[model samples]
Target: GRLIYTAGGYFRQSLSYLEAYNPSDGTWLRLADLQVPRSGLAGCVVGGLLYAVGGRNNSPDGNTDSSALDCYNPMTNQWSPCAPMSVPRNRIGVGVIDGHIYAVGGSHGCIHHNSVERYEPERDEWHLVAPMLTRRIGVGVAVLNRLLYAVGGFDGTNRLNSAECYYPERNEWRMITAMNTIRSGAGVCVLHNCIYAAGGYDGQDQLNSVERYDVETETWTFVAPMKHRRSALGITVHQGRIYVLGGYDGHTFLDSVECYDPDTDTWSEVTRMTSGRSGVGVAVT
Candidate 1:
């Protein structure tokens, strides 16, 4: 019954959006671009606001590694900043549960972190809380119930298959299981306790593989791999479909887009992102 995703991202650093044409019909239209110029950032949407968290910016040295939070409102064509978090974080995993945005596991300098913090927009404030079980960068985060799940990322030495879920109510973190292979910069989202992790880098290797975690069994299982290798892609779930956006292809960054429907356990290539972003996180209004 629901139709196509209204996702943006169509160019290299021009950083705008393009239309998502349906396969049956080639109809196209212009979507919206983020107000700020950024690519390779991590984010998740809560309460209809698409938050572009942190990633490398357009600068060569200083600002290239940035900690800016850029927010987008599609309704009014406006962008604004909420109160920034306490730490300077980038390449991190962001998720929302219980009306709060949880920022977890990112890099500052060369260090992968387990620093987890909570942001409440209603109060215009941020608070430190229990960190993740592991210290890693380029991690993937999703929410199921009150728990925030932290998935694969790099831990300085190599890629990781490790994952953990944090129960915010108890302020506790417990190891769930590990992925099929080590990965970093994949996208993740949860339905119930099951999390789908897809498209990331294993070492210097770009991947097309996907994996999932089942909380009831506390086990990890492999899902259908992607058609092509992609690293740093954005993984998101809207309505009932999971969307995979652009990432690196080792030789180059990508603008390809695909979606997986859990009911069918299948992937169908969709419209290409207008931007060739490698670390994009998506939110829809």
Candidate 2:
């Protein structure tokens, strides 16, 4: 059975919690905690292992940026360290292509970054790749048609509607048609040969609006809105549906989960999470 797993997130405090959702039964089960507490991280499954990438931990001393990489093996029910990222990344965008995980633009310290990196699991190493056209944090990332797409985010100055894609074979990034709405911390995923960008902050307001980009047409079109406004949400594709997990709704952290069916172009609220979480990491395996 395919299961959706969610890692650390922030509600009142940064958490180390991990949980898995079984779609077949519509129930959630608690899992092993992350080695280090993290929020604003990203997760992806490769070779049946779940990788929790860069994020930040809020400590009493101050905000601690994390470059740590931890891999979890379900068979062993354990998590172990892996080679860390060269730079600490908070609100990072991550996608897996050709068995390699690509870590995209995010903020470090006070600076937003355009730098991108790729990780090789076999070598346990991360190497720099082409940087983005614009520096970004809280960006949404997805892989479609062998190309990695980086969607809207804050670029230090303002929220962005700009988008771009990377060609791994050429190690180059090129601009693509921008989205309809400016957004940061949006949930992005590829489905039915198109990319969907969902609820996020538009600088002033948390959004329930969603848009879709047609790879073949190279254009973006409006889609049905979500039930609730959310930013810093965790999104993943499972069984031909897109599921968006907990996030911030501006005033409060959200425990709500929503699922979108492309065939109907509609979104429906599913089971709520065990707790409210923002900046969560989600993936399917």
* Best-fitting candidate, scored by TM-score: 2
- Scored by lDDT, the top model is 2
| Tens-digit lDDT string for candidate 1 (1-285) | 222333322245524342233434534445456555554556656666666676555534444444666666556656687777776666778888987888887887776778888888778678889988789788888888677889898888878989888988799898877888888888787755688888788886888888888878877787887776888787666567777877788877776778787787788887775546666666543
Error of 1 at 42 (Å): 2.0
**Native RMSD of candidate 1 (Å):** 3.1
**Per-residue lDDT over 120-236 for candidate 2, one digit per residue giving the tens place of the 0 to 100 score:** 999999999999999989999999988999999999999999999999999999999999899999999999899999999998999999999999899999988999999999999
In model 2, which runs have C-alpha deviations exceeding 4 angstroms?
Answer: none
- Model 2 accuracy (lDDT, Cα): 0.93
List clashing residue pairs in candidate 2. Answer: none
Q: What's the C-alpha lDDT at position 163 in model 2?
A: 96
